Ligand binder design. Structure first.
Ligand SMILES: CC(C)CCC[C@@H](C)[C@H]1CC[C@H]2[C@@H]3CC=C4C[C@@H](O)CC[C@]4(C)[C@H]3CC[C@]12C
Ligand SMILES: CC(C)CCC[C@@H](C)[C@H]1CC[C@H]2[C@@H]3CC=C4C[C@@H](O)CC[C@]4(C)[C@H]3CC[C@]12C
Ligand SMILES: C[C@H]1CNCCc2ccc(Cl)cc21
Lengths: 230, 264, 336, 221, 42
């Protein structure tokens, strides 16, 4: 399981550039793919989504008519075509793997990313800039504008952790499910529009920024981010 | 008196239609077409037969511009069904593996669509011309007078299917005779030829006279009184062979005989 | 010459011992119990996608996932609530006769005329389902397999033996011998300590897993035994045979209790299963339908008549809210 | 519904498409079952479960050889059954007849035709010419048997091997005529260890069987 | 011979007691059997 992104560089406003992603180590044709953008002082933003069979395609409201996403299964590569670039497009771009069926984990693996330099929605709210703090308990909360509880019994909230110099890593999906490879010190709970994350005992590897994400309707929205400083 | 033949036709069509749904265990590709033929025959019996008896009782008119069209439409549909059945039988008996591979509902649906699409083509202009020219449908009293339709649609309705059916019958008889030269495997291949001959000759006898008389009444004018007298009695023979086709194609498989015995 | 007389004497001793305890019958103590009445069940879901006869079916422990096998060479996992398909697993041989679902939900096993039991891994990082191990050692065809945990499995074959396997090493740890005919069906106790096997010699045996010895042997049927089920409390057998008869055996009275038969039934029995409380007994027949029996009265409470061919599969969920059947018409139905 | 349910529905639809695609290729192969006793020469007729494939006139066949009361149930959808008998061993002909009777009257095989091969004719001919062993020692009814007037012996054959061959073929056929009521037919054949035309006979018999099924389907018989 | 000898040494009980135990088990869990609209998942 490995995803490597390419492309990037310096461009002038009004130009165009094409990005690529090379996949290996898994059945690429059975997974759906996403592009996620992170600005230096804005956090995480979603861009587009392409289905495994090229059936459905979605775009963000700030990129429609300028961005095009394409897939090449026999070559196991992704492409994103960008035209009429603006100053707001300077940011880091990531590639994310997704698979959808009963009991799956749809945001399990993230790439490394490349840098590009130029020249109704559900609001997810976090409010704390830094929580100062080994061996102590820490609680982090999120709040949503609309309820995430669907009639089928599922609540669509996701948690991510970003260590310095590292890509985001999945911790909890659907508010109670611990991801594979995660130590049992992490737990999460909530109901309705209020959610919390609990860490039983902190270590030196638990320093970073935590993000909240919802998966009820497109577009996908992220929180502001909560920084834990040991 | 003559009304009995309508009752028998309706009963036979209902029996054929019912013997496919309730009985089940019937392949769609070959048994769904018989339902379509039975439905066509029932519509003939319901929309055509009761109206001509009224004219027979009155010897006058009252109708005509839409009856004629309905009669032509349904008769064309029945003939097309018979021709399709003959062609399918021949194809199923010469290259036997292929036919087995090809059988699916996408053939039955296609055949039904094609036959019903061809059926309606000849009946559309009948009210179009009649409603703009009274003389074309009323003479002296309801009868289609215009040669431009009698001498044109008749060939498509009857004379091409007859050639197709006779060629198909001859080829099928030859193929069945050749195969037997290679025991129950031999005895079963003669009953099929007997049944095919019976069906072909019944169709030929029941349908041939009317079109010959109708062509002679147009191109050979010949005392018209005798021709119309012959037409008054020949056209009912074409009506009669609408409750026979649902039977002669049915009561040879023991399953159908048992189903008819138990249901009726 | 001398051992035959001793064996006959021992058999007579066992027969005399069994008769002494028959102080009552089920048909007499149940005279104070009201009938269940008429039971109506209707099809709620229809599962399509198989192109051939279905031979095996097994539920998961979450009451939503279901696994089925057919002669087209593929193994399908179903989502019963939405009818969506979850996985499709090609098989290396199309002559499959049994399938099983691991209680942890991570593995599935199958086998048939190739004399091999194959185990598949459903949770991998690559996203594909792959074969984990092949278990060889039998000389006949494989007729039934059931999991005990992620590392232990019990199999029955047509070479008159049963076996206990170690999945980590692929080696057979205990062999169970004593039958004279092909072994058809297995049923594993709730406490995972004993199991029961039926065979073509018209007899049933109770086996001890921990020691590998036969404890009791039951007789009574006139032909081959096709299915065996386990009453929830762990003290009863339910067996079906080709002579159109079902029987109930008890492990403490060591004899038969009640017989389920009818004059209008002249076909074989293919599957037997119980409800949660054990009041209803479900059985499949060759008459293209499934019958519902009252376990305590040997009456008929209802019938399911939605299939167009032989019924080969039958199962009940752990929460008891659904019943699944499989037939040779390539269809699955969920009843409630 | 949620977006994840829509993606799951798309995946299920793709699975259905792939299942439908695989079925088309399977339907183009005809399946055969091979049964017979030891010394019959099963392995040479077309030269857990053994498999073989061959093609005649762009038609593919797949023949299975298992290794009988239980596993015979799963072969009730095959096109035809092939049975091989050694016709040059009189001591074991009753075993072959009993096996053929047990196969013909099986309740799961009531709609499957049987292609019957009577193998090793040369050894039978040599033994009959030698005169060191007589059929009358095992089949008393043979002394009263006469060759039918409609016989078609191969040219050059002595009129003492035809009598034995037709006696054996009659003994095998008489079982098939006692039951079946027309639902299936027997196709007797005489073969040997060196014959190569055996592939064509199966093709012709299968074509005839499919023709009979098609005739029954169209309400002609 | 040994198998019959081993099977002969079984401590048996009366049929009535076993049948009473079966009836008691059936009666005890009667309320939990959904086969014997807002709650049905199908
Ligand atoms: C036979 C001769 C003498 C009849 C003469 C009577 C005159 C009035 C004609 C006009 C139309 C005729 C009918 C039209 C055609 C048929 C169809 C045939 O299947 C039976 C006779 C029957 C039902 C005819 C009976 C006689 C009839 C009513
Ligand atoms: C008079 C007209 C309108 C009747 C229509 C006749 C139809 C039924 C005929 C015309 C052409 C025919 C096809 C010609 C060739 C093949 C290929 C063969 O491998 C399978 C059958 C199949 C597919 C035939 C089926 C029957 C067919 C579709
Ligand atoms: C008069 C009617 C009689 N019935 C059959 C239908 C039909 C078809 C063609 C023509 Cl010319 C005339 C008719």
């Amino acid at each position: 399981v490995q995803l490597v992104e390419s492309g990037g560089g310096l461009v002038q406003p009004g130009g165009s550039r094409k990005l690529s992603c090379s996949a290996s180590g898994f059945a690429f044709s059975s997974f759906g793919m996403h592009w996620v953008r992170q600005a230096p002082e804005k956090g995480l933003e979603w861009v587009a989504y392409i289905s495994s069979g090229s059936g459905t395609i979605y775009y963000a409201d700030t990129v429609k008519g300028r961005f095009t996403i394409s897939r090449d299964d026999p070559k196991n590569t992704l492409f994103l075509q960008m035209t009429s670039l603006r100053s707001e497009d300077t940011a880091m771009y990531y590639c994310v793997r997704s698979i959808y069926y009963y009991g799956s984990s749809p945001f399990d693996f993230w790439g490394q990313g490349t840098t590009l330099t130029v020249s109704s929605d559900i609001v997810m709210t976090q409010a704390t800039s830094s929580v100062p703090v080994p061996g102590e308990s820490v609680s982090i909360s999120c709040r949503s504008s609309k309820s995430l509880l669907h009639s089928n019994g599922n609540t669509y909230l996701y948690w991510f952790l970003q260590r310095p110099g590292q890509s985001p890593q999945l911790l909890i999906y659907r508010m109670s499910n611990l991801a594979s490879g995660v130590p049992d010190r992490f737990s999460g709970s909530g109901s309705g529009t209020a959610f919390t994350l609990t860490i039983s005992r902190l270590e030196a590897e638990d320093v970073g920024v935590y993000y909240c994400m919802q998966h009820l309707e497109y577009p996908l929205t992220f929180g502001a981010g909560t920084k834990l400083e040991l | 008196s003559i009304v009995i033949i309508i009752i028998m036709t309706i009963g036979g069509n209902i029996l054929v239609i019912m013997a496919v749904s309730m009985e089940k265990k019937l392949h769609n590709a070959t048994n769904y077409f018989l339902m379509s033929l039975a439905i066509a025959d029932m519509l003939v019996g319901l929309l055509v037969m009761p109206l001509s008896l009224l004219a027979i009782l009155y010897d006058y008119v009252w109708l005509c511009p839409v009856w004629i069209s309905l009669d032509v439409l349904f008769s064309t549909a029945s003939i097309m069904h018979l021709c399709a059945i003959s062609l399918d039988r021949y194809v199923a008996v010469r290259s036997p593996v292929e036919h087995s591979r090809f059988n699916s509902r996408t053939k039955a649906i296609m055949k039904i669509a094609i036959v019903w699409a061809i059926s309606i083509g000849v009946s559309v202009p009948i009210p179009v011309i009649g409603l703009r020219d009274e003389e074309k449908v009323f003479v002296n009293t309801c009868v289609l007078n215009d040669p431009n339709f009698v001498l044109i649609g008749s060939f498509v309705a009857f004379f091409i299917p007859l050639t197709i059916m006779v060629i198909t019958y001859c080829l099928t008889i030859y193929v069945l005779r050749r195969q037997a030269l290679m025991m129950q495997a031999i005895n079963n291949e003669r009953k099929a030829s007997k049944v095919l001959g019976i069906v072909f000759f019944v169709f030929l006898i029941m349908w041939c006279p009317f079109f010959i008389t109708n062509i002679l009444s147009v191109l050979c004018e010949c005392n018209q009184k005798l021709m119309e007298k012959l037409l008054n009695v020949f056209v009912w023979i074409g009506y009669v062979c609408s409750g026979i086709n649902p039977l002669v194609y049915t009561l040879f498989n023991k399953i159908y005989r048992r189903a008819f015995s138990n249901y009726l | 010459d001398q051992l035959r007389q001793e064996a006959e004497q021992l058999k007579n001793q066992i027969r005399d011992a069994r008769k002494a305890c028959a102080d009552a019958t089920l048909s007499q103590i149940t005279n104070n119990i009201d009938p269940v009445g008429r039971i109506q069940m209707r099809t709620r879901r229809t599962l399509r996608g198989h192109l051939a006869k279905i031979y095996a079916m097994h539920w998961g422990t979450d009451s939503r996932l279901l696994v089925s096998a057919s002669q087209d060479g593929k193994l399908i996992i179903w989502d019963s609530y939405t009818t969506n398909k979850v996985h499709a697993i090609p098989l290396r041989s199309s002559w499959v006769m049994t399938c099983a679902y691991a209680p942890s939900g991570n593995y599935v096993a199958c086998g048939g005329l190739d004399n091999i039991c194959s185990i598949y891994n459903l949770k991998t990082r690559e996203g594909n389902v792959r074969v984990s191990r092949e278990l060889a050692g039998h000389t006949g065809y494989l007729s039934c397999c059931r999991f005990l945990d992620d590392n232990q499995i019990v199999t029955s074959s047509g070479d008159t033996t049963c076996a206990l396997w170690d999945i980590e090493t692929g080696q057979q740890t205990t062999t169970f011998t004593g039958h004279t005919g092909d072994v058809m069906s297995l049923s594993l106790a709730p406490d995972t300590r004993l199991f029961v096997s039926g065979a073509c010699d018209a007899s049933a045996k109770l086996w001890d897993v921990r020691e590998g010895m036969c404890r009791q042997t039951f007789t009574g049927h006139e032909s081959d035994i096709n299915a065996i089920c386990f009453f929830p409390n762990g003290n009863a057998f339910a067996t079906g045979s080709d002579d159109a008869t079902c029987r109930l055996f008890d492990l403490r009275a060591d004899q038969e209790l009640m017989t389920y038969s009818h004059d209008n039934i002249i076909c074989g029995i293919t599957s037997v299963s119980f409800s949660k409380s054990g009041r209803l007994l479900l059985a499949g027949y060759d008459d293209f339908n499934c019958n519902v029996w009252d376990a305590l009265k040997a009456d008929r409470a209802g019938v399911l008549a939605g299939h167009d061919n032989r019924v080969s599969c039958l199962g009940v969920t752990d929460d008891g809210m659904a019943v699944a059947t499989g037939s040779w018409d390539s269809f699955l139905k969920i009843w409630n | 519904v949620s977006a994840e349910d829509k993606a799951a529905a798309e995946r299920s639809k793709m699975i259905d498409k792939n299942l439908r695609e695989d079925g088309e290729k399977a339907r183009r192969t005809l399946r055969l079952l091979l049964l017979g006793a030891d010394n019959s020469g099963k392995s040479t007729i077309v030269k857990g479960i053994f498999e073989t494939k061959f093609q005649v006139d762009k038609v593919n066949f797949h023949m299975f050889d298992v290794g009988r009361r239980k596993w015979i149930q799963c072969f009730n959808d095959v096109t035809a059954i092939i049975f091989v008998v050694d016709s040059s061993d009189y001591n074991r002909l009753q075993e072959a007849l009993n096996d053929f009777k047990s196969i013909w009257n099986n309740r799961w095989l009531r709609t499957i035709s049987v292609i019957l091969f009577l193998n090793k004719q040369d050894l039978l001919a040599e033994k009959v010419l030698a005169g060191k062993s007589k059929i009358e020692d095992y089949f008393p009814e043979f002394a009263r048997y006469t060759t039918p007037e409609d016989a078609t012996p191969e040219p050059g054959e002595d009129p003492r091997v035809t009598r034995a061959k037709y006696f054996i073929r009659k003994e095998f056929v008489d079982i098939s005529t006692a039951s079946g009521d027309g639902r299936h037919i027997c196709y007797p054949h005489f073969t040997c260890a060196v014959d190569t035309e055996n592939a064509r006979r199966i093709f012709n018999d299968c074509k005839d069987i499919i023709l009979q099924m098609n005739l029954r389907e169209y309400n002609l018989v | 011979v040994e198998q019959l000898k081993m099977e002969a040494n079984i401590d048996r009980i009366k049929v009535s007691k076993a049948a009473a135990d079966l009836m008691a088990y059936c009666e005890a869990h009667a309320k939990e059997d959904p086969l014997l609209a807002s709650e049905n998942p199908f």
